[PDB]
Amino acid sequence: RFLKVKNWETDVVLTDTLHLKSTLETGCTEHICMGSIMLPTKDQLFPLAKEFLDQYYSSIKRFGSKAHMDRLEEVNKEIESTSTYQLKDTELIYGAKHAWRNASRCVGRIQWSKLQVFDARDCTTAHGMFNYICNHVKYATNKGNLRSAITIFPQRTDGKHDFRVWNSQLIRYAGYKQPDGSTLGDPANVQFTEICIQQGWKAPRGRFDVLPLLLQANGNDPELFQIPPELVLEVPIRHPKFDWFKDLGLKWYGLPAVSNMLLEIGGLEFSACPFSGWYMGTEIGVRDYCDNSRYNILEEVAKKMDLDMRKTSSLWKDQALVEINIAVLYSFQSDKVTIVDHHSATESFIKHMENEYRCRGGCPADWVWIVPPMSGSITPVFHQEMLNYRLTPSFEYQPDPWNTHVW
Amino acid sequence: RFLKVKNWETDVVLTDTLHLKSTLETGCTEHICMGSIMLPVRTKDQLFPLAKEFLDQYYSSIKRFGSKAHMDRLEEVNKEIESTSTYQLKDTELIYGAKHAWRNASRCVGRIQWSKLQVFDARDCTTAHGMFNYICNHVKYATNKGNLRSAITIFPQRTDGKHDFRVWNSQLIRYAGYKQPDGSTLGDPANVQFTEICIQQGWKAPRGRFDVLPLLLQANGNDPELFQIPPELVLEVPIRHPKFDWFKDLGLKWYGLPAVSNMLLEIGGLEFSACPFSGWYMGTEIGVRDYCDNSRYNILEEVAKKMDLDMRKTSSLWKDQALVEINIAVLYSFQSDKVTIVDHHSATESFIKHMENEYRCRGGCPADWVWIVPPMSGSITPVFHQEMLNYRLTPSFEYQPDPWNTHVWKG
């Protein structure tokens, strides 16, 4: 009941007590572990509000104070009356920082307290959302000196008035299926790239075309907006040893900004809450460039290195994978765009774990997602036992809007 | 109840019913997942259900469920249990049991081979010397001049827990580790504690970097004894690199036969505490873990120096570069000497085929993603985007405490 986690490379042992404050469910049972599965009313609301306000007032060392009780009372009144309630700016900021803090799959959480929170709950239209998003992008990008941020649009009401950003990230490349069979651009975005055209987008039908924004305000029909190009920082990819690398014509954007998740605070649901940080090198080089269902450029690179691609035993895939990732990091660093390598990020996360166990009694962590997609065992998180559990406030998944939108 | 797993690279979806036959616990609850935790005397009372469940399984596989052969065996086992408090397995049952423990090993990526297991029945063994003999025959048969063959040798089952057979070594073949006074380690740091025990038990340690450890064998709950595997039985492979000639000068070599000897085999409620088993290596076991783990030979830096890599910032990925070259060398060396080895791309590919086939013919394949995914180049292997369900089936291989921690010393 007071759980222990061991690091087998350093024998260090942490004791977890934070898990007892867990609310939501994991997917697993005593008979079956689902750790590798990607996705497993007025009465509901007040306990949720209470739990949150209780942790909020605890966090500011005013647990059981006048302010505390008064606020609990005030929210209780507003719920009974309005069948929902509003967060004070302070609670909203606390909640967003804490959703990040509780993201068990996020390796970058040592940064959690430095999140810049933009309150966009006064937004009413898609044009309004566009403006807030542009502002977020420019602030976050900061001419390459990236800063973490989240922008929070109005909360769900009766689920018929939802704000949604239809893109999965604020900034992604288009994907169009070819007559010749294969795919131009980004295969992950083929269906979305089409719904854009299907709603009016004029695709340049190129390979690295920045997708337009598709913004839904108050449950209305979504609108197309193009992010000003000067706001989209991009990095051309070159290798610091191979000059032929640049002729592959590769580039990536500097700002990773996830826009399709739902932020839950004190039982309230924020269905539009785009958030951003900065990339770990492997995210672009290993998953984005080298996944089969993506840009899949391993073969091409390996050819240009003239490796023996006859037998898998030569490890040419591994050799290329490394070079590609050396290049990504090299390109960002040379162009002064923030990026972290998987060795540094994982080392930082171990330290963050140390801190969290010490000052909070634990840190929910999902090993399947924390371990990088290359060189796993040579990073310190590989031999680190982790406990995975769900705390709130949180970021959750939510259905793609098109599967739901009552037109 | 039906459960689905999706492969997110190919969109292939599979459906698991096999998890319904799951007995043991996972460690997980609805409120906590312990999927990355390494590890999360039995009476007539609980023995007959366990026996019955096994014999049911067994007679189904041979398509004789409910036959007179089936019923008579249940009655036979029952009588023997209430009469003797345990029971004996037939050879057919032993063999079936051992194949299935491998087959149910959720952490094993090489399970495609599970039906080709050579089972040696060592239940007539009574002494340590007898154990040494059986183990030598195992090593020779399994090794087969480099053309490796999967095998398991099974010593007598536990009775009262006070007369256990144990192989004290974690693997039949492993290199000594010696802690030096300056805190440095000579040889394999993973085996220091065990090495010390051997020295204490009278082993004359040559104190080199690659000394093969002696066998420490316990028969029938007696004190363990030391035996030296004949060197001619120990196949080793010097490590060289196909392009780098300085690599051989690092003086590395590894043994060819991976043979795990500290696990417990459970079949129909019976516990086999000494059951050494072997297959062949996946390259990264030696190249990534055995050489490059910080708690192991840790030659990453030395290889990187000789490659003249930019070791100033980690973002040069020098570590990643040296790791690949070291694994290239391991495979190259083994193939050149015609000693069976499999690369991680080949092994994961085969596993996905195995797994898919297991879902069709069996209704599932328990699998521990945390252990199935290779320790380098994870996402460019096909298991990485493969959702997997983990649950525990018997027969099974289980962990057990180290014997030096539990043994009652005779003298």
Ligand code: HEM
């Ligand atoms: C600042 C540097 C950051 C780094 C280096 C980072 C890194 C990562 C990485 C590597 C993953 C694994 C996902 C994958 O492999 O594609 C991840 C997931 C995640 N990150 Fe972070 N992140 C950062 C900032 C943030 C911020 C600011 C937030 C929210 C405020 C956040 C929330 C999340 C969430 C919720 C997930 C899991 C998403 C899911 O379950 O699909 N991250 N992050």
Ligand code: HEM
């Ligand atoms: C024939 C070639 C085989 C290959 C390539 C193979 C591969 C592997 C690998 C790579 C691991 C993970 C080890 C690690 O990285 O730490 C593993 C674990 C395991 N293997 Fe296999 N294996 C083979 C044969 C066998 C055989 C013959 C058995 C038993 C009869 C077996 C039973 C197991 C078990 C029980 C585990 C998990 C042990 C644990 O949970 O600590 N394997 N295997």
Ligand SMILES: CNCc1cccc(CCc2ccc3c(C)cc(N)nc3c2)c1
């Ligand atoms: C290969 N992934 C597959 C996949 C599948 C579903 C969702 C995701 C998003 C993970 C995610 C979410 C937010 C992030 C932020 C803020 C920064 C950052 N550097 N990385 C981030 C990654 C990814």
Ligand SMILES: CNCc1cccc(CCc2ccc3c(C)cc(N)nc3c2)c1
């Ligand atoms: C460096 N890892 C740490 C670690 C910790 C506990 C146990 C193990 C060995 C797993 C194991 C057991 C049996 C195996 C057989 C028969 C063949 C084979 N190729 N590999 C095998 C691996 C490893």
Ligand SMILES: C[C@H](O)[C@H](O)[C@H]1CNc2nc(N)[nH]c(=O)c2N1
């Ligand atoms: C099926 C597989 O478990 C799933 O796609 C996960 C595996 N681990 C991952 N880990 C990270 N960091 N990112 C991912 O997208 C995934 N994918």
Ligand SMILES: C[C@H](O)[C@H](O)[C@H]1CNc2nc(N)[nH]c(=O)c2N1
């Ligand atoms: C804590 C962590 O789960 C543990 O060290 C595991 C991780 N996955 C592994 N996977 C393999 N194949 N071998 C291992 O030894 C480990 N170690």
Ligand SMILES: [Zn+2]
């Ligand atoms: Zn679990």
